Design a protein around this ligand. Structure first.
Ligand SMILES: O=C([O-])C(=O)[O-]
Ligand SMILES: [Mn+2]
Length: 600
């Protein structure tokens, strides 16, 4: 019954222009034994054809097209609802090159395990070969990839999340380099066996081979485990490429801010989860003459331009956002982006009229079908209607505040890099670094609340493709070798400081634009602030609070730098620097010592 690649349907009509790609596909098909092989072109006719099959399989239902055109709901296996960090591996030749923030396994050992798993794993399934490009196609060094997958759901979501299909394939030419990404849901089928809507396995691996730029995923059909352009490529593999090639692959939103003089400023901002990252990416300023547009709300690739400034591009093509908490009152621009349709929703609730709902959304629906397919009742049912990690997957081009520069292969010049977290105490609303190296330290020691303070350096803690210490050195290196005058200024922001009684000292949301105005003014040297031990921090009088009904004392408290509180912060930072291990750069330790000295 086992078939040689050549006789597997689809391989006789495969594109032969790129032999390297073709040989790889043949090798994989020989191993996984799919029923047939399909090379995807990303066209509209293909998209609708795959969606018809997804509806037929029960993987998708078609949502009411009067409310969301060309849109679908998928409900997953309850065992397969999120990225699985404990099953995610960086398989560098040496363990030190994965480092303490990463899960390592010897690559020989990993390949033996996974090749065994892949054997026969696609029986009874179509094997898709999915070409894609990360970033605009017109780039100087376009970062290409091919994902092989046995998941039709994956193909469709990749079409939205990346520039998928024909254009990318042509960009590969006859022998062009591309990232080899391999994926299987790990659920082979017997002839005539009825499938389930969401196949998956109990056994999962999401594995990265940094030297060869390869990604192997098995067992999950969900999000970042399976859509391999998203975290696996754009952050983990890309950070390794960036390390070797002199640029930066970062977990940052890209925001365009326009002042009343009609000048544009671009910011790249890194936050961990639960810090309102998406609300900031789609900010609506609350002060006259200030406007904001987005270029991305997740990943940013930054590369020095010929003028010596840092330029950012969004390598992605779609949004893959957490649905619960998204609503009209707090993020109408996200709602409007979704309202335009062409969206795949996963694990949200279904309204009686074929619309969608999730916790946080307006409407107080009286009855819903929940993410498990069960009846749900308002102010009664004690379980969430939508899964807390449920998602919308929607084209970026539908965003009403999308910046026109979003598809420019040259990217946009970054004036400021922001780092942020949630801190009840200690860390002020906004701080500016003293210089680049201090900036690196501020990013490297980014703390955010946990059940107590978690360190999430540059918000890359679960996404680094190599040793965290070498990563810090890489940041130091790029700044050291640059024109200092053209480097982005670095800021840390804490929207979430609290009074002793638990009040929020800063109202946040749209009012965050007032802090961004200060940042712009600092960049233009039009604003002051206090020199504190931790950097430049504005006083209340440095901020535009006009029109804002807020207690000035609360804002003052939000901005306070208390030496005693910061002395308490020191040993937390120290233990983190120790955890970073033998590769911790002296330049980062230097900044710790300078801080400790300034505090006295
Ligand atoms: O889902 C995501 O984008 C994450 O966890 O950062
Ligand atoms: Mn993210």
């Amino acid at each position: 019954s086992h078939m040689t690649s050549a006789t597997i349907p689809g391989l006789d009509t495969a594109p032969t222009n790129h032999q390297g790609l073709l040989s790889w596909v043949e090798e994989v098909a020989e191993l996984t034994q799919p029923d047939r092989v399909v090379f995807t072109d990303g066209s509209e006719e293909e998209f609708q054809r795959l969606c018809d099959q997804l509806v037929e399989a029960g993987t998708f239902i078609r949502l009411n097209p009067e409310k969301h055109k060309n849109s679908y709901l998928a409900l997953s296996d309850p065992s397969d609802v999120a990225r699985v960090e404990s099953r995610t591996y960086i398989c560098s030749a040496k363990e030190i090159d994965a480092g303490p923030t990463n899960n390592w396994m010897d690559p020989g050992e990993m390949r033996s395990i996974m090749k065994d798993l892949y054997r026969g794993c696609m029986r009874g399934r179509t094997m898709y070969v999915v070409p894609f490009c990360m970033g605009p196609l017109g780039a100087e060094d376009p970062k290409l990839g091919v994902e092989i997958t046995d998941s039709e759901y994956v193909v469709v979501s990749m079409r939205t999340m990346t520039r998928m299909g024909k254009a990318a394939l042509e960009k590969m030419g006859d022998d062009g380099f591309f990232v080899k990404a391999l994926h299987s849901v790990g659920a082979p089928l017997e002839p005539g066996q009825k499938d389930v809507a969401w196949p998956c396995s109990e056994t999962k691996y999401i594995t990265h081979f940094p030297e060869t730029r390869e990604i192997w995923s098995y067992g999950s059909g969900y999000g970042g485990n399976a859509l391999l352009g998203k975290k696996c490529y754009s952050l983990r593999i890309a950070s390794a490429m960036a390390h070797d090639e002199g640029w930066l692959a970062e977990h940052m939103l890209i925001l365009k801010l326009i002042s009343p003089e009609n000048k544009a400023y671009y910011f790249a901002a890194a936050f961990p989860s639960a810090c309102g990252k998406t609300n900031l990416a789609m900010l609506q300023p609350t002060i006259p003459g200030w406007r904001a547009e987005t270029l991305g709300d997740d990943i940013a690739w930054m590369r020095f331009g010929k003028d010596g400034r840092l330029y950012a591009v969004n390598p992605e093509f779609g949004f893959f956002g957490v649905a619960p908490g998204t609503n009209w009152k707090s993020n109408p621009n996200a709602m409007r982006t979704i309202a335009a349709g062409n969206t795949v929703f996963t694990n949200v609730a279904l309204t009686d009229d074929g619309d969608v709902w999730w916790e946080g959304l307006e409407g107080d629906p009286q009855h819903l079908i929940d993410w498990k397919g069960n009846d749900w009742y308002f102010r009664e049912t004690e379980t969430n209607a939508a899964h807390p990690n449920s998602r919308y997957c929607t084209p970026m081009s539908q965003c009403p505040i999308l910046a026109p520069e979003w598809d420019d292969p040259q990217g946009v010049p970054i004036s400021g890099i922001l780092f942020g977290g949630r801190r009840k105490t200690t860390v002020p609303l906004v701080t500016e670094a003293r210089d680049w190296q201090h900036g690196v330290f501020i990013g490297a020691t980014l703390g955010s609340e946990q059940t107590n303070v978690r360190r999430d350096p540059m918000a890359m803690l679960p996404f680094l493709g190599y040793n965290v210490g070498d990563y810090f050195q890489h940041w130091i290196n790029l700044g050291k070798h640059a024109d200092e005058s053209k480097l982005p200024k670095v800021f840390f922001v804490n929207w979430f400081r609290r009074g002793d009684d638990g009040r929020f000292l800063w109202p946040g949301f749209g009012e965050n634009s007032r802090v961004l105005k200060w940042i712009v003014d600092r960049i233009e040297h039009k604003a002051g602030g206090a020199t504190t031990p931790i950097g430049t921090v504005p006083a209340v009088e440095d901020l535009d609070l006009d029109g804002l009904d807020v207690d000035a004392a609360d804002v003052a408290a939000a901005l306070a730098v208390d030496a005693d509180e910061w002395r308490q912060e020191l040993p937390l930072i120290e233990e983190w620097l120790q955890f970073v291990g033998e590769k911790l750069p002296t330049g980062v330790k230097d900044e710790f010592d300078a801080l400790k000295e300034r505090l006295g």
